[PDB]
Amino acid sequence: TECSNLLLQYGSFCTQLNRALTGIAVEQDKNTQEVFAQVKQIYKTPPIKD
Amino acid sequence: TNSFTRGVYYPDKVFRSSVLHSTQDLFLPFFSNVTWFHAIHVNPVLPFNDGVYFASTEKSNIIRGWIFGLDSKTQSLLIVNNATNVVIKVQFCNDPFLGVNNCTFEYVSQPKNLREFVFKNIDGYFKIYSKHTPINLVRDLPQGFSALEPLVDLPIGINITRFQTAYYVGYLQPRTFLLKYNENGTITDAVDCALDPLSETKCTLKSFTVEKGIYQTSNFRVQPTESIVRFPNICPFGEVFNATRFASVYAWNRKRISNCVADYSVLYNSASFSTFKCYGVSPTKLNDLCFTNVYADRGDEVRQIAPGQTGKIADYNYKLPDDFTGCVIAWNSNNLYRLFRKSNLKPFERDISEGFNCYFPLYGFQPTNGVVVLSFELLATVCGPKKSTNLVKNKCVNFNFNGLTGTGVLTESNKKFLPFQQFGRDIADTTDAVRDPQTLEILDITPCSFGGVSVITPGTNTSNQVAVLYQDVNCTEVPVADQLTPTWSNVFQTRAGCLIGAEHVNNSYECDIPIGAGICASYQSQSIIAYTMSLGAENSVAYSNNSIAIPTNFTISVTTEILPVSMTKTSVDCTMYICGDSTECSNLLLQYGSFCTQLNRALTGIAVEQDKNTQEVFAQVKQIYKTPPIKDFGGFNFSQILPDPSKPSKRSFIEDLLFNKVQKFLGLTVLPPLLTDEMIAQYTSALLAGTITSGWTFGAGAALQIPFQMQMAYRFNGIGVTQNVFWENQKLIANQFNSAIGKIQDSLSSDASALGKLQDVVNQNLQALNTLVEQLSSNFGAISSVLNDILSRLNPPEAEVQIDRLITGRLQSLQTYVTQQLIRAAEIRASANLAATKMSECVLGQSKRVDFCGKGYHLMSFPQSAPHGVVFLHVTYVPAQEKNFTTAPAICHDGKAHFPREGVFVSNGTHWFVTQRNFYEPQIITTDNTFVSGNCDVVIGIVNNTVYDPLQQE
Amino acid sequence: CAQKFLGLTVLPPLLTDEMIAQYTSALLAGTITSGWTFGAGAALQIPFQMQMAYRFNGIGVTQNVFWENQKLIANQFNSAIGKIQDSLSSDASALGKLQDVVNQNLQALNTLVEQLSSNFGAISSVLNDILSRLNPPEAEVQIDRLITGRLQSLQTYVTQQLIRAAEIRASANLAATKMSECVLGQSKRVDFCGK
Amino acid sequence: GTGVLTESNKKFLPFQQFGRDIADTTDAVRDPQTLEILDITPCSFGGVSV
Amino acid sequence: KCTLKSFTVEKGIYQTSNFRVQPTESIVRFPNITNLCPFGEVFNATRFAS
Amino acid sequence: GKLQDVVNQNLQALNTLVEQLSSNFGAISSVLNDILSRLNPPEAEVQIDR
């Protein structure tokens, strides 16, 4: 605890860090969704590949 | 004891208005249980704590005077709090209420209800806050806001309180919380932290209103509850540290004994023996810390303890390293030599082996004048005795392996500790495993569980319900170390997290509040619902070797794609950010290798770049096309997108709607855009006109001139729609376009959903500044966060240290800001070159890029300006009303395969015709509309039909 | 114990390998069913062989070039996919950039993790033991300097992770472009879709 | 500090001697010697572009 | 020229200096306490012993 | 200029590092040698750490 109270002396350090990291995390999901989850439909691969 | 009675008060805080501020001032959480009332009717009250809050009713005084305060012994106040001279006394007639060593410290005379004397504590003295007493609550507990501060601090010093006197008492906890100050700086309903996870989110985001989303709330840990300080325990040390023998100049021992159990140099802890100095350790942690050195080792100069000092220790006397750990004690009243040494000494060197004839010889026992250190190792132990509980399995404790303090569970000694049988390290940290000092057969490899907490918030404008997920969790159970309110409350046992849940749905739906891991949530009889994220809708259309779907009709859809172009570019002048109005630190500004100048240089670079981004995105012209005064272009009501009417100074209607959506002396400034919103609107005009009047305004030299219907004719022709509908469907294409603009005007301009992506930059930029300025309110280890206070409080030789500490902190934060912005500038540059590319190939021409310039087959895009960005209305062609026709590539009987020139040999079961992938619009095979190479070939797909040659002409 | 307790964890992707594979299935299925005729979701069904004829015609050869060579073309295709099945095996190129990205991040943490042990000018780095050894008053260096050091290491980590993210975002933007132009579309661009 | 003193446009509760801004820099001070509070604006400042 | 350490400066606008406004007065505001602080009762006390 | 600006910023980035060395960072002097010449034994660690 003592070091956490001392870390708080570096005011709101991690709030900024956590936000940046979270921003990266949503950006990653945004990238996946944007890259391949591009379809509003899921066409099912035909059972007969003729 | 419910209804969320708000334990709020102004915590001696400066008046602030229109703000949201967080603190930890021991407020009253809404946890009240029972209170002491209804004593009499038609039973003494003695509740006590330091962390208390009192509230009650009124008829006269009711409390027979409000009191606070043992009995007639010490520090007894029993303040009357009545009209007749309230005094701070420190027990006879006041024992009962009045009516039906008397040393005083202070005099104040400060003077159904809701009288509150709440929030008490000492702070070395006294603390008390008080609230108004409304008389129209028509209930027992008022929805209130806060208590005020008449005067709180007085010379009381009560270590404990138990005095009072239809009654209410609450008890305080040192919790963090959020206080909302309205425009009049009145604290409105506050939000406790750890009251509930939604409140945790509100604290987390330092914002009461919380949009629907997954917010990462504070982490969670199980509490270590016990500790081990175990060692076999029980040497001369405890007695021989003192020695009559005094020969230390030619002697500094280190190991009088290798193993001590009698180690308690209280001589230092209480200074029961003499003066001392400890290096690297507390003087009091003598049985908490242990070293493998138990003994060691005078002169008028104890100044020569000298861990790297410039004394006689350098060459004659005993030397210690600058990086020395240990503790030294001295002796006096006591009534070998420090002769000259030609060589220098090394740390911990013990050398007791040219100045004419004076180098070889080498004290005085008479009272010439009234004119000893133990080194500490870094390690196991064998000193500083201590004992505790036995090994604790399956629950987490502190002090794992005694000499170290860990929070791991003491289980599973599945490690051999082969060479030494004592200690293990992790792949990534000092401590991984231990062998218990007394029973060397058991281990600590399981640190008390810990992880992050994500919270699902449905959006506070709809619901106050939440779901919570421990990011890494067994999904077997959740401990109670925190809200502490719910049970562990059927919850989806997902790896994403599982503490308190949501209906775990066996059905599937569109994604919302995406927790991640293929799991989404919503509030849809309102409750949190957790779903397995579904995919897009199933498409089951059959395909065959001869089945082709061909549109018979079409629509024009307008995709509104909004891209950031520029940042809310700023310039931080560190002279103020760090040193505003501070002249003492002025020397420090110069101290740097222009680091500040370089940080500002980076932001200036960013700003110039931002102007360049706007310039590429909008300024690709030399002569601007003035929108012709027509409103006559195929009837397309471009009047809705062009800045023609001059109602606003320059803006178009769509851009008006875009601009209708979407902080002083901060030490920084937000530089004006080079091109104002008015100029951008005018460049927008320059592009839209020209775009609808000539075409390639840049690429084709103002694009000569086009009737506009010829233009979109050619654009259809570009997308692959040739000689099909651009002329046949005049008044239909125009109508669909028009309707699409209506679709944007009442949809995104009413929501700003798609439009909020612009703010992904603006919000972040503001947050970045908000972070930066908020970062100022930080001590960084300095005595105070306020530089001017350091200057007003500390002298030069002492202030500079803390000034520099604060400066270093602020410089680290500023570098962080510059860096964050340099990277965001790069990202926006990437979006800006995308936007410029899109303006160039979507607006200044017809891009063949599929699903790039909007959804579907882009034929056109009409840009509009947005604050720090561009919105492209990409008018795209979409096929519609598809019919499943039979296809084949070829026919014969003419001795010619006759493959379709550009079309498809398609039939409705008969009437084999040829058309394209644009519209049904069937046509007779028409030899001139086919391509022949191969005749009656072995090629797959001949349908044995015939085609008329227009030149048969018989 | 590859991933230990350092506060450094991984949040699962929204789109899990099942979800990614599932979307990929849709994408391929759309490719073999509408090819390019999509109103960004509004697929128009075409027979695959016919789609190939149209794509071939879109590249400057006639539809009959494909049809005359239907057997050739389809058979060359089958051989080519087999070639890739083998050429992507035997750890070829370590699957290129994908390995690199993961390597770019695991190391990002091995570095961050290593920094945990740095003393930052202090005697030690084991903060819990530092507090045990000395009292907070005597911790301007023992704790706060250490904290500052870790602060910088984390800030460096996020900074580099943001750069990594920016780079990744650009890669993803290009990948998305390919996803909508190269697949679910016919690129007319040289080396956009490979040589 | 340094700044422009002006009559505030808002009365503040008597319990505090001074107020603070969003940037946590002093917003206003009640005069210890007078029954008034004066907004304090940081003295005009900014960059110089040549 | 100094900001860029070059005697010849390219045509353009440069972020050169820092504009702050010089204060025109020194304003001292303290409560009008006329009671000399009884430090003598603290430091010239007859008995500190206890 | 496009291709000059890049080399420029790269070199400038180097130029900056050179300038940075000149900083004392709050130290008694700017060069390790001076530190090593003035307060070496007792405070080299402190000044050097700075």
A27 CA: distance to closest CA in chain B (Å): 11
Flag if B547 and C13 touch (Cβ within 8 Å): no
Residue F18 three-state SS: helix
C-alpha B293: how far from its chain's center?
A: 46
Please list the alpha-helical segments (H only) found in B653-729. 653-659, 677-691, 709-719
What residues have CB less than 8 Å from A30, skipping those under 6 apart?
none
Nearest to A10 among B514, B764, B778 (CB): B778
What residues have CB less than 8 Å from F6, skipping those under 6 apart?
none
Instruction: Identify the closest residue of chain F to C149 by CA–CA distance.
Output: F49
Interrupted backbone of chain A, residues before each interruption (C–N > 2.5 Å): none
Burial B64-101 (b: 16+ CB within 10 A, else e): ebbbbbeeeeebbbbbbbbeeebebbbbeebeebeeee
Q: Which residues in chain F have Cβ-Cβ distances shorter than 8 Å to B594? A: 19
Nearest to B15 among D13, D22, D45 (CB): D13
Distance CA C50, CA B466 (A): 52
Distance CA A7, CA B953 (A): 95
The DSSP 8-state label assigned to residue B843 in this structure reads: I
Please report the beta strands in B789-932, taking only residues with DSSP state E, as ranges in sequence order. 857-866, 869-888, 899-900, 904-907, 913-915, 930-931
Distance CA B858, CA C39 (A): 10
Q: Which residues in chain B have Cβ-Cβ distances shorter than 8 Å to E3? A: 597
- Please name every residue paired with B900 in a beta bridge, in sequence order, or none if there are none: B930
Q: Are B401 and B430 in contact (CB under 8 A)?
A: no
What residues have CB less than 8 Å from C83, skipping those under 6 apart?
none
- Please name every residue paired with B467 in a beta bridge, in sequence order, or none if there are none: B456
Instruction: Identify the closest residue of chain D to B777 by CA–CA distance.
Output: D24
Q: Are E21 and D43 in contact (CB under 8 A)?
A: yes
Q: Which residues in chain A have Cβ-Cβ distances shorter than 8 Å to B20? A: none
The DSSP 8-state label assigned to residue B307 in this structure reads: B
Picking from F8, F21, F23, F40 by the largest number of B CB atoms within 10 A of its own CB, the best residue to mutate is: F23
Picking from B454, B852, B899 by the largest number of C CB atoms within 10 A of its own CB, the best residue to mutate is: B899
Q: What are phi and psi of C43, to 5 degrees?
A: -70, 140
Q: Are D40 and D26 in contact (CB under 8 A)?
A: yes
Flag if A9 and B779 touch (Cβ within 8 Å): yes
Residue B540: how many CB atoms within 10 A of its CB? Answer: 10
What residues have CB less than 8 Å from A38, skipping those under 6 apart?
B851, C23, C27, C40, C176, C179, C180, C184
Flag if B776 and D10 touch (Cβ within 8 Å): no
Q: Are B94 and B82 in contact (CB under 8 A)?
A: no
C-alpha distances (whole Å) from B808 to each of B182, B505, F28 are 35, 52, 16
Distance CA B756, CA B752 (A): 6
* Residues 667-686, chain B, touching D (beta carbon < 8 A): 667, 669
The amino acid sitting at C114 is E
Picking from B594, B612, B818 by the largest number of F CB atoms within 10 A of its own CB, the best residue to mutate is: B594
- Helices B796-838 and C146-181, interaxial angle, to 10°? 0
Please name which of B127, B122, B145 lies closest in space to residue B7, comparing C-alpha atoms: B145
Flag if B405 and C128 touch (Cβ within 8 Å): yes
The verdict on D44 touching E (C-beta cutoff 8 Å) is: yes
Flag if C40 and A42 touch (Cβ within 8 Å): no
C-alpha B392: how far from its chain's center?
A: 36
The verdict on E23 touching D (C-beta cutoff 8 Å) is: yes
The verdict on B954 touching F (C-beta cutoff 8 Å) is: no
For residue C110, give the H/E element and its range.
Answer: helix C97-116
Q: Are B171 and B52 in contact (CB under 8 A)?
A: yes
For residue B433, give the H/E element and its range.
Answer: strand B433-434
Please name which of D10, C148, C35 lies closest in space to residue B182, comparing C-alpha atoms: D10
* Chains in contact with E via at least 3 Cβ–Cβ pairs below 8 Å: B, D
C-alpha distances (whole Å) from E7 to each of B464, B600, B682, D49, F8 are 65, 21, 39, 17, 18
Contacts within 8 Å (CB) and 24+ apart, B893-896: B893/B944, B893/B945, B893/B946, B894/B927, B894/B946, B894/B947, B895/B935, B895/B936, B896/B930, B896/B932, B896/B935, B896/B936
Q: Which residues in chain B have Cβ-Cβ distances shorter than 8 Å to E20? A: 575-576
The DSSP 8-state label assigned to residue B118 in this structure reads: E
Q: Which residues in chain D have Cβ-Cβ distances shorter than 8 Å to B667? A: 23
Residue B714 three-state SS: helix
Q: Are B117 and B68 in contact (CB under 8 A)?
A: yes
Q: Are A10 and C148 in contact (CB under 8 A)?
A: yes
Q: Are B549 and B884 in contact (CB under 8 A)?
A: yes
Residue B99 three-state SS: coil
- Please name every residue paired with D20 in a beta bridge, in sequence order, or none if there are none: D26
Flag if D42 and B580 touch (Cβ within 8 Å): yes
Distance CA B417, CA B423 (A): 7
Q: Are B549 and C44 in contact (CB under 8 A)?
A: yes
Flag if B573 and E18 touch (Cβ within 8 Å): yes
Q: Are B239 and B273 in contact (CB under 8 A)?
A: no
Return the half-sphere exposure (C-beta side, CA atoms, 13 A cut-off) of residue B817: 31
Strand pairing class (B869-888; B857-866): antiparallel
Please name which of C167, C129, E23 lies closest in space to residue B399, comparing C-alpha atoms: C129
Distance CA C151, CA A14 (A): 9
Burial B484-504 (b: 16+ CB within 10 A, else e): eeeeeeebbebbbbbbbbbbb
Please name which of B561, B503, B568, B558 lies closest in space to residue B532, comparing C-alpha atoms: B503
Q: Are B148 and B10 in contact (CB under 8 A)?
A: yes
Three-state SS across B808-820?
HHHHHHHHHHHHH
Classify burial at C89, counting beta carbons within 10 Å of its beta carbon; exposed 0-12, middle 13-18, buried 19 or more: exposed
Nearest to A42 among B536, B545, B774 (CB): B536
Q: What are phi and psi of B287, to 5 degrees?
A: -110, 5
Contacts within 8 Å (CB) and 24+ apart, C175-178: C175/A35, C175/A36, C176/A31, C176/A34, C176/A35, C176/A36, C176/A38, C177/B849, C177/B852
CA-derived radius of gyration, chain E: 28
B31 CA: distance to closest CA in chain D (Å): 28
- Please name every residue paired with D29 in a beta bridge, in sequence order, or none if there are none: D18, D38
Determine what percent of chain D falls in helix, strand and coil, rounding each to the nearest 5.
0, 50, 50
Three-state SS across B128-168?
CEEECCCCCCCCCCCCCCCEECCCCCCCCCCCCCCCCCCCE
Distance CA B503, CA B517 (A): 17
Distance CA C22, CA C137 (A): 58
Instruction: Identify the closest residue of chain B to F22 by CA–CA distance.
Output: B593
The verdict on B13 touching D (C-beta cutoff 8 Å) is: yes
C-alpha distances (whole Å) from B832 to each of B727, B849, F1 are 36, 18, 20
Please name which of B500, B564, B558, B492 lies closest in space to residue B531, comparing C-alpha atoms: B492
* Chains in contact with F via at least 3 Cβ–Cβ pairs below 8 Å: B, C
Lateral strand order in the sheet of B177-181:
B19-23, B177-181, B187-192
C-alpha B122: how far from its chain's center?
A: 34
Nearest to B889 among C53, C140, C145 (CB): C53
Determine what percent of chain F falls in helix, strand and coil, rounding each to the nearest 5.
75, 0, 25
What residues have CB less than 8 Å from B568, skipping those under 6 apart?
B670, B761, B762, B765, B766, B868
Please name which of B330, B350, B334, B346 lies closest in space to residue B251, comparing C-alpha atoms: B350
The amino acid sitting at B691 is T
Q: Are C161 and C108 in contact (CB under 8 A)?
A: yes
Residue that has been written with the tokens 């601090």 in this structure: B153
Instruction: Identify the closest residue of chain B to D22 by CA–CA distance.
Output: B19
The amino acid sitting at E14 is Y
Q: Are A47 and C37 in contact (CB under 8 A)?
A: no
What residues have CB less than 8 Å from B21, skipping those under 6 apart?
B13, B178, B179, B181
* Experimentally determined by: cryo-EM
Distance CA B714, CA B700 (A): 15
Distance CA B532, CA B517 (A): 9
Distance CA B658, CA B867 (A): 8
Please name which of B899, B915, B897 lies closest in space to residue B907, comparing C-alpha atoms: B915
C-alpha distances (whole Å) from B21 to each of B14, B201, B777 are 11, 15, 12
Q: What residues of C are in the A interface, CB distance below 8 Å? A: 11, 13-15, 19-20, 22-30, 32-34, 40-41, 43, 127, 131, 136, 139, 143-144, 147-148, 151, 154-155, 158, 161-162, 165, 168-169, 172-173, 175-176, 179-180, 184
- Please name every residue paired with D38 in a beta bridge, in sequence order, or none if there are none: D7, D29
Q: Are B778 and B809 in contact (CB under 8 A)?
A: yes
Picking from A39, A45, A49, A50 by the largest number of C CB atoms within 10 A of its own CB, the best residue to mutate is: A39
Q: Which residues in chain A have Cβ-Cβ distances shorter than 8 Å to C70? A: none
Q: Are B358 and B340 in contact (CB under 8 A)?
A: yes
Please name which of B592, B594, B588, B593 lies closest in space to residue B790, comparing C-alpha atoms: B588
C88 CA: distance to closest CA in chain F (Å): 37
Return the half-sphere exposure (C-beta side, CA atoms, 13 A cut-off) of residue B239: 2
Burial E17-47 (b: 16+ CB within 10 A, else e): eeebeeeeeeeeeeeeeeeeeeeeeeeeeee
Q: Which residues in chain F have Cβ-Cβ distances shorter than 8 Å to C145? A: 49
Distance CA B1, CA B37 (A): 12
Flag if E18 and B571 touch (Cβ within 8 Å): no
What residues have CB less than 8 Å from B192, skipping those under 6 apart?
B7, B27, B29, B30, B175, B177, B199
C-alpha distances (whole Å) from B574 to each of B77, B814, F25 are 53, 8, 16
The verdict on B15 touching D (C-beta cutoff 8 Å) is: yes
Flag if B571 and E15 touch (Cβ within 8 Å): yes
Flag if D47 and E20 touch (Cβ within 8 Å): no
Residue B922: how many CB atoms within 10 A of its CB? Answer: 17
Nearest to E30 among D2, D32, D43 (CB): D32
State both tokens at B748: 């995104």
CB-defined contacts B:C, below 8 A: 215
Classify burial at B111, counting beta carbons within 10 Å of its beta carbon; exposed 0-12, middle 13-18, buried 19 or more: exposed
Flag if C68 and B933 touch (Cβ within 8 Å): yes
Please name which of B284, B338, B335 lies closest in space to residue B306, comparing C-alpha atoms: B338
Most distant CA pair in chain C, distance = 88
Flag if E3 and B597 touch (Cβ within 8 Å): yes
Please name which of C176, A42, F49, C122 lies closest in space to residue B325, comparing C-alpha atoms: C122
Distance CA B932, CA B541 (A): 33
Residue C171: how many CB atoms within 10 A of its CB? Answer: 14
Residue B278: how many CB atoms within 10 A of its CB? Answer: 22
What residues have CB less than 8 Å from B379, skipping those under 6 apart?
B290, B291, B292, B403
Indicate contact of E with A: 3+ CB pairs under 8 A: no
The verdict on D9 touching E (C-beta cutoff 8 Å) is: no
Distance CA B638, CA B691 (A): 11
Residue B389 three-state SS: coil
Distance CA B277, CA B372 (A): 10
Distance CA D41, CA B929 (A): 80
C-alpha distances (whole Å) from B556 to each of B728, B857, B880, B947, F40 are 15, 10, 10, 35, 79
The verdict on F49 touching C (C-beta cutoff 8 Å) is: yes
Please list the alpha-helical segments (H only) found in B578-665. 586-591, 595-618, 653-659
- Please name every residue paired with B877 in a beta bridge, in sequence order, or none if there are none: B556, B857
Residue C74 three-state SS: helix
CB-defined contacts B:F, below 8 A: 38
D29 CA: distance to closest CA in chain B (Å): 9
